[PDB]
């Protein structure tokens, strides 16, 4: 089968930068090479077909070149909404259509400080048996943020799971939700429930806490 | 009238791969829909063109090549392959446009005592060009001393027999291949869908 | 203006069957070739099948050949995918795709939105929705917990509250169920005046839940 | 993708007997794709039979092959001492493949070893090391025990052994046990001896020398 | 007078490269299927690579991307370039005409050359005599060499009856040591000279030791 190798796997670039993606083929595929853009949660969209032909309605900042085994996709001026995963796909072997691994393009921007909110477990949830403590980091950059759970000043690890939103199409910022799941018996056993946040945009770690039933 | 693809596909006897047959198809209407949606093909691969697109396209001439090879060798009937078959028997170009169609013919081409009528070229000095056909049976000189048409040490008959027996493994069973080439010249097309 | 609308995805057990449909609009459907392409969760794109304009010719990828079936009704402008003997590897989001017809070869110019197919022998459990009351603006939300399978659609005020909403991806906790969080930041002034209700919908279990979120 | 399996692993026969070596296949392989190769110790492999049953040029008439499908057989009609070797079957599907090989050991009557002991040369002693060599020459079967005694003290931990393959002419083995000491430790003792027990000996055999004499 | 004569074997460090040679007489390399088959110590045969007369090359999965087969017509010689070598590449490498397919069997074969992949260094052997006292015994002790192999003949090959050259043993110091013995009639000790001819191929150390009584 024909394998399509895309490089790089991932790249960081700021708004207005020239971005170039490389797709290589295990054998000559003439000019039948197509590029797709897939936003998070959305269906792929055709940008370039036949190596360099612009699909109708695609913005002019997209273009392609190449022949034989080495092909290129170029974004001349990166825009915020251009955050997506980009795929090449060969159409020379028409009954064995294969895609590349994909190149995820991330938007680089200035540092944004997260807004930390902490939520105690609801009374409807305590009636069921479980208890979830949610901590929210909102509209920050870069994605790399450390969320640390402290229950009675005791470091917690393994009781929670994080979830990050994909880069915002508007301001290119992330958001995080750490859900500290634990039973009711473990909940009333302690009192203090804190959420510590370490980020590049914080001159010192920020902590949002609350006391149980106060 | 219709292009005669059946005389190629439905043929009772097939050529050896070294002496592969070519039927030149011209001045007719090609009905690919009925041709493709017919028998069960263990291999169906097209390059540079979709099978469902052929009904819309016009060609100056269409070539239908046919031959028999081993199961393990079908992978060599493709652009950019190498091996005994692609190098010395039947070679497709790197920019091949057309379709390769193969199906198991163990019921038709194998014999209880071994079918030795099907051959492939085993020895050759250099590789074949694309779509080249070499039917020579000259003794192959594998050493310094010439052969003078006599078999012996370093002097081999260039063709080998498969010996198809009906209970061999599928990799050793005979497969019938048809290769459709689509010639696009700067001349009035004679084949349209 | 070309639209492709998928339907039929859901939950299915290993070895069972399922049928996906794709309704096409605003182009000469009965003269284009149609494709199915799937994308397993977190993985890449994989071509599945193609069918000719007249439905006579069908071709499949090796990974589903003899197992899936593609068909079309041109009088209804609908493309079909019949999936039998479903294995665990078949869990993916299935797209239909129009060809394009400007080349001699296949490509995908328009795609459908995709429908999710989960091959599993688990139970379709409805979600539990709990509020997140707020304690210099404020933030509140809802916690969709203990549901299976994907997905759940969460809106705010029946689709009226758009800006400042963040719905996080689901996480598969150790219980095998999914847990999801959806928050929204509002000005701290309108907290006891404006009403906030999250709209959770879980089609696999047919569960629609509206919950009041008050401080 | 066609796997072949040879059996048995080792074959133990007497001269003149009939040797049957099998090469089983998972799928049915045509006979024209099967070949047999012989490799004697320290030598390159040699082509015996090709096409399952066609004898290679110059191969003695006692070697013959047969079989088809999933079962191929190499037969050595009259087994000779020189036939001690490893035999491989070999076929081609998408690439060349070799079987695991079958060893043909040759049975022989019991034979007691000739035991020799060699002192370290003066040339080696000057370098600071002494090697004492005990030789067990032309014995059968292979099982032997060699025990070093220095001034009647059994030694362990300072000796190493090495055994030859079965001799291609008389099917016997030979063993070498080397006792290694520093020159200083070698000068501290007088009587060096290796005791040999073997099935062919009614009683253990000891060979000794006195350092100096 | 058909022969395949190999060279280029010996010691190489892990991750290093090495090129083996196979000089042919009695056949034309560029006109044949030419293969390499290798044998790890104590193990069976493994096909490695093949070059067709037309120039096509094929490689076993265990060597793909690291080995390169080639030939030189003017020198009528086959080559094998071995890169990124590891411990699993330590073996005796044979060259042979043919591919092991019908009408195309491995025949003839080269004599083989041993490749040793280790981080140690090449050391030449020291040769000491095993001096004798109906039949007597004498021999040669070949001590402290690396890597394998050494070969031992007697009286320049004129004495072959009764010679036993033992397989080398790895000493605790990491150097090999073997002994070669021969049994002769005791009467010929004073009227027949015995020389053992030691050849350590990786270092070209050829030593001839006369073994006399004391
Ligand atoms: C081959 O013959 C069958 C009837 O025996 C027919 O149905 C089929 O169309 C023929 N194939 C072609 C390509 O005409
Ligand atoms: Cl048969
Ligand atoms: Cl229509
Ligand atoms: Cl169009
Ligand atoms: Cl056969
Ligand atoms: Cl290594
Ligand atoms: Cl072959
Ligand atoms: Cl050695």
Residues C10, C119: contact at Cβ < 8 Å? no
Shared domain check, B193 and B98? yes
Grouping H, G, I as helix, E, B as strand and the rest as coil, residue B58 is strand
Q: Which of E72, E99, E117 delimits the end of a domain?
A: E117
Shared domain check, E102 and E157? no
| Closest C-alpha to ligand 1, atom 3 | B10
Shared domain check, E102 and E55? yes
Helix/strand/coil (H/E/C) assignment for every residue in chain D: CCCEEEECCEEEECCCCCEEEEEEEEEEECHHHCEEEEECCCCCCEEEEECCCEECCCCCCCEEEEEEEEEEEEEECCCCHHHCEEEEEEEECCCEEECCCEEEEECCCCECCEEEEECCCHHHHCCCEEEEEEEEEEEECCCEEEEEEECCEEECCCEEEEECCCCCCCCCEEEEEEEEEEHHHHHCCCEEEEEEEECCCCCCEEEEEECCC
- Token look-up 């139970």 returns C123
Q: Which of C96, C119, C142 delimits the end of a domain?
A: C119
Measured distance CA(D74)–CA(D67) in Å, rounded: 9
Shared domain check, A124 and A90? no
Buried b (16+ CB within 10 A) or exposed e, A193-212: bbbbbebeeeeeebebebee
Shared domain check, D8 and D90? yes
Contact state of A27 with B79 under an 8 Å Cβ cutoff: yes
Measured distance CA(D65)–CA(D74) in Å, rounded: 4
Shared domain check, B88 and B7? yes
Cβ within 8 Å of C, B 89-118: 97
Shared domain check, D98 and D151? no
Shared domain check, D197 and D121? yes
Shared domain check, B14 and B62? yes
Shared domain check, E49 and E155? no
Residues D133, D178: contact at Cβ < 8 Å? yes
The residue range of the domain holding D24 is: 4-106
Shared domain check, C186 and C159? yes
Shared domain check, D120 and D102? no
Measured distance CA(A161)–CA(A138) in Å, rounded: 17
- The CATH number assigned to the domain holding C182 equals 2.60.40.10
Q: D61: left (phi > 0), else alpha (psi -120 to 50), else beta? A: alpha
Shared domain check, B128 and B57? no
Residues B110, B14: contact at Cβ < 8 Å? no
Measured distance CA(A106)–CA(A139) in Å, rounded: 15
Residues E155, E194: contact at Cβ < 8 Å? yes
Q: E63 CB contacts (<8 Å, ≥6 apart)?
A: E48, E49, E82, E89
Q: E101 CB contacts (<8 Å, ≥6 apart)?
A: B84, D33, D92, D96
Grouping H, G, I as helix, E, B as strand and the rest as coil, residue B141 is strand
Measured distance CA(D87)–CA(D64) in Å, rounded: 13
Shared domain check, E206 and E105? no
Number of domains making up chain D: 2
Per CB-CB distance under 8 Å, the chain B contacts of E55 are 126-127
Residues A209, A117: contact at Cβ < 8 Å? no
Q: B36: left (phi > 0), else alpha (psi -120 to 50), else beta? A: alpha
Per CB-CB distance under 8 Å, the chain A contacts of C186 are none
Q: B4 CB contacts (<8 Å, ≥6 apart)?
A: B23, B25, B28
Q: E51 CB contacts (<8 Å, ≥6 apart)?
A: E33, E34, E35, E57, E69, E70, E71, E78
Residues E116, E147: contact at Cβ < 8 Å? yes
- Token look-up 């009764």 returns E162
Residues A39, A105: contact at Cβ < 8 Å? no
Shared domain check, D155 and D89? no
Per CB-CB distance under 8 Å, the chain B contacts of A95 are 44-46, 51
Shared domain check, C49 and C23? yes
Shared domain check, A91 and A126? no
User: Of all helices (H) and strands (E), which one includes residue E164?
Assistant: strand E163-165
CA distances from D209 to A143, D134, D201, E2 (A): 82, 11, 21, 52
Contacting D with CB below 8 Å, chain B residues are 72, 114, 161, 163, 165, 167-169, 171-172
Residues D69, D22: contact at Cβ < 8 Å? no
Contact state of C181 with A177 under an 8 Å Cβ cutoff: yes
Closest chain A residue to the Cα of C61, Cα to Cα:
A96
Shared domain check, E130 and E93? no
- The CATH number assigned to the domain holding A11 equals 2.60.40.10
Residues D193, D207: contact at Cβ < 8 Å? yes
Q: Pull the structure tokens for residue B51.
A: 């099978």
Residues E18, E114: contact at Cβ < 8 Å? no
Shared domain check, D202 and D118? yes
Shared domain check, D15 and D50? yes
Shared domain check, E80 and E161? no
Shared domain check, B73 and B10? yes
Q: Which of D52, D86, D106 delimits the end of a domain?
A: D106
Per CB-CB distance under 8 Å, the chain E contacts of B84 are 52, 101
Contact state of B48 with C105 under an 8 Å Cβ cutoff: yes
Please state the atom number of ligand 1 nearest to the C-alpha of residue B35. 13
Shared domain check, D145 and D184? yes
- Token look-up 């390399």 returns E29
Shared domain check, C107 and C12? yes
Count of CA atoms in the C-beta half-sphere (13 A) of B187: 10
Q: Which of C58, C91, C119 delimits the end of a domain?
A: C119
The one-character DSSP state at A123 is H
Q: Do chains C and D touch (3 or more CB pairs under 8 A)?
A: no
Shared domain check, E73 and E103? yes
Phi, psi of A183 (to 5 degrees): -75, 170
The residue range of the domain holding E8 is: 3-117
Q: Is B7 in the pocket of ligand 1 (CB under 6 A)?
A: no
Contact state of E56 with B88 under an 8 Å Cβ cutoff: no
Measured distance CA(B35)–CA(B190) in Å, rounded: 18
How far E16 CA sits from the closest chain D CA (Å)? 26
Angle at D43 between CA D37 and CA D47, to 5 degrees: 20
Shared domain check, B64 and B38? yes
Residues A138, A115: contact at Cβ < 8 Å? yes
Number of domains making up chain B: 2
Shared domain check, B121 and B99? no
CA distances from C8 to A71, B136, C208 (A): 37, 61, 19
Residues C111, A97: contact at Cβ < 8 Å? no
Shared domain check, E63 and E95? yes
Angle at D57 between CA D51 and CA D59, to 5 degrees: 90
Shared domain check, C160 and C113? no
Q: Pull the structure tokens for residue E62.
A: 């265990």
Measured distance CA(D192)–CA(D149) in Å, rounded: 6
How far D211 CA sits from the closest chain E CA (Å)? 13
User: Of all helices (H) and strands (E), which one includes residue A188?
Assistant: helix A184-188
Shared domain check, B105 and B10? yes
For chain C, the DSSP string reads: --EEEEE---EE-TT--EEEEEEEESS-GGGS-EEEEEE-TTS--EEEEEE-TTS--EEE-TTTTTTEEEEEETTTTEEEEEE-S--GGG-EEEEEEE---SSSS---SEE---EEEEE-SS--BPPEEEEE-----EEEEEEEEEEBSS--EEEEGGGTB-TTEEEPPPEE-TTSSEEEEEEEEE-SSTTSSS-EEEEEEETTTTEEEEEEE--
Count of CA atoms in the C-beta half-sphere (13 A) of D114: 13
CA distances from B39 to B44, B69, C117, E26, E60 (A): 11, 19, 33, 52, 36
Q: Is B171 in the pocket of ligand 1 (CB under 6 A)?
A: no
Number of domains making up chain C: 2
Count of CA atoms in the C-beta half-sphere (13 A) of D5: 8
Residues B85, B69: contact at Cβ < 8 Å? yes
Shared domain check, A205 and A124? yes
Contact state of A122 with C134 under an 8 Å Cβ cutoff: no
Contact state of D114 with E135 under an 8 Å Cβ cutoff: yes
Measured distance CA(D191)–CA(D172) in Å, rounded: 30
Phi, psi of B7 (to 5 degrees): -55, -25
Q: Is B36 in the pocket of ligand 1 (CB under 6 A)?
A: no
Q: Which of D106, D126, D156 delimits the end of a domain?
A: D106
Shared domain check, D94 and D31? yes
Report the Cα–Cα distance between both ends of chain E, in Å, rounded. 46
Per CB-CB distance under 8 Å, the chain D contacts of E91 are none
Q: Pull the structure tokens for residue A118.
A: 């902490």
The residue range of the domain holding B71 is: 1-113+166-193
Taking the centre of ligand 8 as the mean of its atom positions, its distance from the CA of residue E151, in whole angstroms, is 7
């Amino acid at each position: 089968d024909i394998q399509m190798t895309q490089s790089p796997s991932s790249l960081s670039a700021s708004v207005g930068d020239r971005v170039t993606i490389t797709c290589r083929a295990s054998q000559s595929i003439s000019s039948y090479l197509n590029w797709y853009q897939q936003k998070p949660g959305k269906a792929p969209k055709l940008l370039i077909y036949a190596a360099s032909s612009l699909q109708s309605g695609v913005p002019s900042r997209f273009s392609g070149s190449g022949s034989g085994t080495d092909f290129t996709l170029t974004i001349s001026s990166l825009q915020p909404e251009d955050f997506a995963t980009y795929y090449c796909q060969q159409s020379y072997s028409t009954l064995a259509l294969t895609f590349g691994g994909g190149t995820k393009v991330e938007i680089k921007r200035t540092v944004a400080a997260p807004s930390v909110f902490i939520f105690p477990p609801s009374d409807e949830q305590l009636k069921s048996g479980t208890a979830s403590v949610v901590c929210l980091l909102n509209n920050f950059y870069p994605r790399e943020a450390k969320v640390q759970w402290k229950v009675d000043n005791a470091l917690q690890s393994g009781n929670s799971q994080e979830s990050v939103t994909e880069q915002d199409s508007k301001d290119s910022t992330y958001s995080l939700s750490s859900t500290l799941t634990l039973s009711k018996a473990d909940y009333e056993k302690h009192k203090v429930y804190a959420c510590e946040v370490t980020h590049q945009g914080l001159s010192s770690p920020v902590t949002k806490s609350f006391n149980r039933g106060e | 009238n219709l292009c005669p693809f059946g005389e190629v596909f439905n043929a009772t006897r097939f050529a050896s791969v070294y002496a592969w047959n070519r039927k030149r198809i011209s001045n007719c209407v090609a009905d690919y829909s009925v041709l493709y949606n017919s028998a069960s093909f263990s291999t169906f691969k097209c390059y540079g063109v979709s099978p469902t697109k052929l009904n819309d396209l016009c060609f100056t001439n269409v070539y239908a090549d046919s031959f028999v090879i081993r199961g393990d060798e079908v992978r060599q009937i493709a652009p950019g392959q190498t091996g005994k078959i692609a190098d010395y028997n039947y070679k497709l170009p790197d920019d091949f446009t057309g379709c390769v169609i193969a199906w198991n013919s163990n019921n038709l081409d194998s014999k209880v005592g071994g079918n030795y009528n099907y051959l492939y070229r085993l020895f050759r000095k250099s590789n074949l060009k694309p779509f080249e056909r070499d039917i020579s049976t000259e003794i192959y000189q594998a050493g310094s001393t010439p052969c003078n048409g006599v078999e012996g040490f370093n002097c081999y008959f260039p063709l080998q027999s498969y010996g198809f027996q009906p209970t061999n493994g599928v990799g050793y069973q005979p497969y019938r291949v048809v290769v459709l080439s689509f010639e696009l010249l700067h001349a009035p097309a004679t084949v349209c869908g | 203006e070309v639209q492709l609308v998928e339907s039929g995805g859901g939950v299915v057990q290993p070895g069972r069957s399922l049928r996906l449909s794709c309704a096409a609009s605003a182009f000469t459907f009965s003269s284009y070739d149609m494709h199915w392409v799937r994308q397993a969760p977190g993985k890449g794109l994989e071509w599945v099948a193609v069918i000719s304009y007249d439905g006579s010719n069908k071709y499949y990828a090796d990974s589903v050949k003899g197992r899936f079936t593609i068909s079309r009704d041109n009088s209804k402008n609908t493309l079909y995918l019949q999936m039998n003997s479903l294995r665990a590897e078949d869990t993916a989001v299935y797209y239909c795709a129009k060809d394009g017809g400007k080349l001699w070869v296949y490509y995908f110019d328009y795609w459908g939105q995709g429908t999710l197919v989960t091959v599993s022998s688990a139970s379709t459990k409805g979600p539990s929705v709990f509020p997140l009351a707020p304690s210099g603006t404020a933030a509140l939300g809802c916690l969709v917990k203990d549901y299976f399978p994907e997905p759940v659609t969460v809106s705010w005020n029946s689709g009226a509250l758009t800006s400042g909403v963040h719905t996080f991806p689901a996480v598969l906790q150790s219980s095998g169920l999914y847990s999801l969080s959806s928050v929204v930041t509002v000005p701290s002034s309108s907290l006891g005046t404006q009403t906030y209700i999250c709209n959770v919908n879980h089609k696999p279990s047919n569960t629609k839940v509206d919950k009041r979120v008050e401080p």
